[PDB]
Amino acid sequence: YEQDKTYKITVLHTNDHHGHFWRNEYGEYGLAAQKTLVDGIRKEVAAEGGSVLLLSGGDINTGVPESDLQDAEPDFRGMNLVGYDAMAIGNHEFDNPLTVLRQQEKWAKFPLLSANIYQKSTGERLFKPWALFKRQDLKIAVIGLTTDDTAKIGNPEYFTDIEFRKPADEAKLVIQELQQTEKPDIIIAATHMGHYDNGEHGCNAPGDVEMARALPAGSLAMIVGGHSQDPVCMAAENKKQVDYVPGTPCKPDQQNGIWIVQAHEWGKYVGRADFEFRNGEMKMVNYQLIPVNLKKKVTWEDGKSERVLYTPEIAENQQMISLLSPFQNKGKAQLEVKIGETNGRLEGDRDKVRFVQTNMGRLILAAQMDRTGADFAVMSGGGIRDSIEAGDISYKNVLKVQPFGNVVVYADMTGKEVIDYLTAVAQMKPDSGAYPQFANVSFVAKDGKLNDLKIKGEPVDPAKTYRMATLNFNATGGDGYPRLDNKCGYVNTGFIDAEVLKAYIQKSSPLDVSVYEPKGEVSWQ
């Protein structure tokens, strides 16, 4: 570069897009409004003498039926039209086989990066570790890293020949290789690892904060993150704002001289970090998280309910809407295709599910345990929102039963944590949404205490390990359920309730409802 010259560099970022190429049902986000916003930024940045780099923290895949059924094709193409420069590979990039991910890499006109994922049989990288960019006459390297929780938490049959090495250790190596060979002026990491306040990752793999603290000071200008699905806007040193409000000031984290940023999920925001580079040094001069037509739900004095924009409305780019519409249309048609059949009614009438054990509870929970490899499972009966009629089943029928996009989760727990949890959960009452549906659970409750507690037909052993499935809602205290998210053994899978029930029905069909029919395994009084 030229000594004593100030370069202007604007870094844009998103992450955890999870199939949200289309806006949602209240008119928020979507890539069309993203495109309008980012196109306008590029012109402004250029008018002021600067350059743009646009990066993703990954997890493009998995979260919306119309995207998932088309292997995220609309998403990746849309990202081309927005103009992404690079992306980190996310754990949900491994939800589908490598055949599909390699096809995504060819759909994408930008690299999908990860330095830390190796083939076990050869010791070679499966992906490109970094990409180099020219902006002005600066050389900018972007390294990609992926959480090493991927393979403890994803389909084991996919990871026979795939190893996830510690990312922080990989970053130290790549930074040293880069600094000894290509010699970039600036290095940024796009990662998929997560932001934990003060590096308190608990039982998750270490994330961005721990990494930045482990690296040499200032060796990265910044980390563009993901996976935890947070707006990184600090309330105070080492503490994110809880309930960040769109359109407000957002101070990103800085740890050991390294900025750490994240833009939540689902294209809700485009993050914008403006930097000035002079004589080797990067200075952050402005940061903002820019809402993409995010709205707040309000009920005013008169019971008129609306969603109100936090910031001025961004118009949908028409060229992105032409690109995306045929996928949206094909996805909506794919929802009506038969995915299974049942030989009797699956019962999800509001009363039945809030009062007694139904065959819909058993079907949903089998689906959740099949997905997480769990031993047993519970949810709120008021999570079940409809029945499926005896006969053919479409994804659309399943979306009626599970329409609100909750996330399936699991927890590993001692037989004794099992006993303490099911105990307080069996205190929940009928005529109420909190009423527990259970699977692979048998007991007789009397006096708020459990007698003949059986997971899958065997008594519980207090020093045994058991895997429970449930929903994110129940796991974070919802329905006054005992919190599981601050426990060791907890894992948020990112898989959506309707997708999990649909997949389970597709592979189990045709269904024989008698295997799902409750035979009095749980009872009270």
Choosing from 15, 16, 386, 472, the catalytic residue is 16
475 a known binding residue? yes
Task: Count the site residues for Ni ion by CB under 5 A.
Answer: 4
Scanning the structure block, which residue is given the tokens 């190893």?
Answer: 163
**Least distance in angstroms from the C-beta of 63 to Ni ion:** 11
| Rounded-to-5 percentages of helix, strand, coil across the chain | 30, 30, 40
Sole window of 55-63, 216-224, 308-316, 440-448 interacting with Ni ion (rule: CB under 5 A):
55-63
Task: Compare residues 59 and 230 and give the one whose CB is closer to Ni ion.
Answer: 59
Residues 6+ apart with CB under 8 A from 64: 18, 19, 20, 21, 22
Q: Is 91 a catalytic residue?
A: yes
Question: Residues 439, 443, 445, 450: what is their CA dihedral angle, to the nearest 10 degrees?
Answer: -110
Sole window of 106-114, 137-145, 219-227, 321-329 interacting with Ni ion (rule: CB under 5 A):
219-227
13 a known binding residue? no
Task: Compare residues 116 and 380 and give the one whose CB is closer to Ni ion.
Answer: 116
47 a known binding residue? no
Burial of 82 (0-12, 13-18, 19+ CB in 10 A): buried
241 a known binding residue? no
Residues 6+ apart with CB under 8 A from 229: 16, 262, 264, 265
**Least distance in angstroms from the C-beta of 151 to Ni ion:** 13
Sole window of 56-64, 69-77, 81-89, 384-392 interacting with Ni ion (rule: CB under 5 A):
56-64
3-class secondary-structure state, position 502: helix
By the rule CB under 5 A, 91 interacts with Ni ion: yes
Choosing from 136, 350, 392, 485, the catalytic residue is 350
**Least distance in angstroms from the C-beta of 49 to Ni ion:** 36
Q: Is 197 a catalytic residue?
A: no
Q: Is 227 a catalytic residue?
A: yes
By the rule CB under 5 A, 195 interacts with Ni ion: no
Q: Is 385 a catalytic residue?
A: yes
Q: Is 208 a catalytic residue?
A: no
Sole window of 86-94, 314-322, 373-381, 510-518 interacting with Ni ion (rule: CB under 5 A):
86-94
**Least distance in angstroms from the C-beta of 226 to Ni ion:** 6
Task: Compare residues 402 and 492 and give the one whose CB is closer to Ni ion.
Answer: 492
C-alpha distances in angstroms, 290 versus 110, 248, 267, 284? 23, 9, 10, 17
By the rule CB under 5 A, 59 interacts with Ni ion: yes
- Contact present, 509 and 340 (Cβ < 8 Å): yes
Task: Compare residues 36 and 228 and give the one whose CB is closer to Ni ion.
Answer: 228
Sole window of 57-65, 276-284, 309-317, 380-388 interacting with Ni ion (rule: CB under 5 A):
57-65
Q: Which residue type occupies 310?
A: Y
Q: Is 350 a catalytic residue?
A: yes
473 a known binding residue? yes
**Least distance in angstroms from the C-beta of 189 to Ni ion:** 16
The first and second tokens of residue 57, run together, are 């923290």
By the rule CB under 5 A, 36 interacts with Ni ion: no
- Contact present, 481 and 425 (Cβ < 8 Å): yes
Distance between CA atoms of 271 and 288, rounded to whole angstroms? 6
Choosing from 61, 229, 293, 472, the catalytic residue is 229
71 a known binding residue? no
18 a known binding residue? yes
**Least distance in angstroms from the C-beta of 306 to Ni ion:** 32
Burial of 93 (0-12, 13-18, 19+ CB in 10 A): buried
- In a 13 Å sphere around the CA of 81, the CA atoms on its Cβ side amount to 24
The first and second tokens of residue 467, run together, are 């895997």
By the rule CB under 5 A, 227 interacts with Ni ion: yes
Omega prior to 510 cis, within 30 of 0: yes
**Least distance in angstroms from the C-beta of 149 to Ni ion:** 8
DSSP codes of every residue in 155-202? -GGGGTTEEE--HHHHHHHHHHHHHHTT--SEEEEEEES---GGG--T
Could you tell me which residues are annotated as the binding site for substrate?
350-354, 473-479
Residues that bind Ni ion (CB under 5 A): 59, 90-91, 227
Which residues carry out catalysis?
Answer: 16, 18, 59, 91-92, 95, 192, 227, 229, 350, 354, 385
